[PDB]
């Protein structure tokens, strides 16, 4: 079949997302052909990322320290909080280079097979950050999904009673998109949200 | 090479957009194999569409009559005009099923190799429709292009001095899009345009 070990690697690698049995092989071999120092590194890396991983006690983003890097920054507005459902969403948001607020990851909002060793949702703490802080606005940056919606709504409900300006990220036509082509839904929301001048 | 006629058809067909030399052949043969009545139809069709074509004297959309079907409808708000740069944009807009205004195609806004037998731009008439009508709003439904912009702007300028509410179609994240994935620009506009609650 396959050298019992090489067999093994293929299995591990295949368990990965988007990594199919074919591309699995190609990689097993590259790896195996790689230089033992290079190989070690790929290996330390994979394991140390798992144990070291931790979740900011302030915003619940992924990070390696007790409190995340954004949070403990100082050069950033801790009075605008950008709400988000999944930690990658921050890395998306964060390549914007023109946002200066902090964030809040609601976790178990996306709870597919969640609670993986104890992954639970964080709405309560979002409130207490607002209920007990001095927050100006709360930007909901969640999916135009029918799932991204209803979060945006719900949460706008829990926050409305406070003094905060709750706002949602804009839905419509992507920069460099063509309405000639766009989805009707899309372009249908694109209508609903037309803004003066 | 190719039966001189079959040769010919391939040439004509290839002149078409997105129709490449290979797919050209496949079609030539299907066609040629098609039933002479079916073939005639494809043929009448192609030519009659060209001559019959005409441009609504009211909104400058493509149509076969002297004035377009929307325009002469009655069941539609002729006081909301949806501005657009290219007649397909209307067919996009029009599958929305929740717009009840009329439109205006600015033509030579998209003037690539325009003036094809006399295709010229229609901004002036957009004004006179407003300057001499009773129009409530003017929805600019143009591309998040850097080209779609500047139209939206310019035209909002020409109309501002009137009483009209000028509004632009919304830019951001497509319905069923994922900001985890979206373009930075996109998602960067998606920020700029955040709307309360
Ligand atoms: Zn943090
Ligand atoms: Zn018309």
Taking CA atoms, A145 is separated from A35, A42, A65, A138, A141, in Å, by 44, 36, 32, 19, 12
**Strand spans (E) along chain B:** 54-55, 62-63, 77-84, 101-105, 137-140, 165-168, 195-196
**Do residues A63 and A95 share a domain?**
no
Comparing C-alpha atoms, which of A82, A78, A127 is closest to residue A105? Answer: A82
**Do residues A132 and A62 share a domain?**
no
Asked if B195 lies within 8 A of A167 by C-beta distance, the reply is: yes
- Resolution rounded to one decimal, in angstroms: 2.8
Mutate to test the interface with B, among A105, A167, A194 (most CBs of B within 10 A): A194
Structure tokens at A39: 């190989």
Comparing C-alpha atoms, which of B189, B185, B183, B187 is closest to residue B169? Answer: B189
Sign of CA dihedral B124, B125, B131, B137: negative
A188 vs B96: CA distance, rounded Å: 6
**Do residues A67 and A83 share a domain?**
no
Q: At what angle do helices A4-14 and A21-33 cross, to 10 degrees?
A: 120
**Do residues A8 and A91 share a domain?**
no
Sign of CA dihedral A105, A111, A112, A114: positive
**Do residues A99 and A123 share a domain?**
yes
**Do residues B154 and B93 share a domain?**
yes
Q: What is the CATH number of the domain that holds A94?
A: 3.40.1360.10
Q: What is the CATH number of the domain that holds A61?
A: 3.30.60.80
Judge whether A59 and A102 are in contact, CB under 8 Å: yes
How many domains, in total, are found in chain A? Answer: 4
Q: What is the CA radius of gyration of chain B?
A: 21
**Do residues A35 and A108 share a domain?**
no
Mutate to test the interface with B, among A97, A143, A184, A190 (most CBs of B within 10 A): A190
Judge whether B172 and A173 are in contact, CB under 8 Å: yes
Domain range spanning residue A18? 1-52
Interface of A with B in 159-178 (CB under 8 A): 160, 165-178
Residues paired with residue A104 on neighbouring β-strands, in sequence order: A83
**Do residues B84 and B148 share a domain?**
yes
Q: What is the CATH number of the domain that holds B187?
A: 6.10.250.240
**Do residues B144 and B182 share a domain?**
no
**Do residues A33 and A108 share a domain?**
no
**Do residues B115 and B189 share a domain?**
no
Comparing C-alpha atoms, which of A89, A194, A71, A68 is closest to residue A140? Answer: A89
Q: What is the CATH number of the domain that holds A1?
A: 1.10.8.420
**Do residues A57 and A132 share a domain?**
no
**Which ligand gives the minimal distance to the CA of B64?**
2
Query: What technique solved it?
Result: X-ray
């Amino acid at each position: 079949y396959y050298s019992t070990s090489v067999a093994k690697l293929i299995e591990e690698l295949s368990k990965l997302p988007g990594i199919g049995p074919g591309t699995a092989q190609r990689l097993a071999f590259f790896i195996i052909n790689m230089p033992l120092d290079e190989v070690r590194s790929l290996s330390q890396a994979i394991i140390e990322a798992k144990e070291k991983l931790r979740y900011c006690k302030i915003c619940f983003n992924i990070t390696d320290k007790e409190v995340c890097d954004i949070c403990s920054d100082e050069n950033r507005d801790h009075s605008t909080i950008c709400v988000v459902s999944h930690p990658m969403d921050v890395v998306a948001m964060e390549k914007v280079k023109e946002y200066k607020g902090v964030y809040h990851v609601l976790h178990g909002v996306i709870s597919p097979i969640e609670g993986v060793g104890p992954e639970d949702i964080r709405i309560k703490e979002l409130l207490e950050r607002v209920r007990d802080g001095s927050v100006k606005e709360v930007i909901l940056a969640t999916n135009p999904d029918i799932e991204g919606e209803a979060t945006a709504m719900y949460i706008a409900k829990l926050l409305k009673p406070f003094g905060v300006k709750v706002t949602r990220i804009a839905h419509g036509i992507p920069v460099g998109g063509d309405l000639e082509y766009t989805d009707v839904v899309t372009l249908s929301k694109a209508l609903e949200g037309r803004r003066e001048v």
